[PDB]
Amino acid sequence: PQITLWQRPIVTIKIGGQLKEALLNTGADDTVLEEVNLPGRWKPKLIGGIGGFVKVRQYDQVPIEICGHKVIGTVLVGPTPANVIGRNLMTQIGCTLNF
Amino acid sequence: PQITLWQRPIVTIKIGGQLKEALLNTGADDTVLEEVNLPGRWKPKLIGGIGGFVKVRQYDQVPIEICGHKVIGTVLVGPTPANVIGRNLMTQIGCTLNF
C-alpha cells in the first residue's frame, strides 16, 4: 500500500498466533511488542537509555505478518507504550519513504 | 527520493537560516529541533509525558526546507536527543510509506 501520514501509520500484524496492531515507526531501530507469547529462544536486551534502561526479551528470526506481508525478523517483547514496527522489519517488507 | 530503511533516514534541512540534519520519524506526531533561533511568535508546549513532561517552544507556520522541499509547518524548539521531522512536516513534503 501507499500510506499517507495525516494519521498515525497503525497497521494490523499477526504474531505468535495473535492479531495485533502496531505503529510503523521509521524513528525506531527495533520492533517492540507487548503481551505476545513467543516460543523458542530469547535473551534479555537493554533498550532506551533515557532515565535508566528498559529490559526486554529479544527473540531472533521471528515469523511475523505485517499488513499482509509474511516476513522474518527480530522482535523485542516487553512493556511499550505503543506496539512499534521498527526499521528492522520495515526493511523486510520492502517499505520505503517516498516524496 | 525513495529512501530505504536499512540505515536511519537522516536528511538535510534548512531552518532559521541554518543547515541541520534531522531524522524522518513516522512515529513522531510533531517536529522537534534543538539549537535553532527562530524569529516571530511562540508559546510553551508540554510534550512527552513519560517520567514527567518536557517544555518546548512552539512556533507555528515556520518555513523550512526538507531534503529540497520548501514547506511550512509547526516546529517545536527544545533540547531533543535527535532532531526529528514528525508526521506534521512529512505530510507537507508529500512523504508516504510504500510497500
Binding site: 527495533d30 521498527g86 | 535527535a82
Partner: peptide, 7 residues
C-alpha cells in the same frame, strides 16, 4: 506522541 529510539 513522539518516537525515536535506539537501545
Amino acid at each position: 506522541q513522539n518516537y525515536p529510539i535506539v537501545q
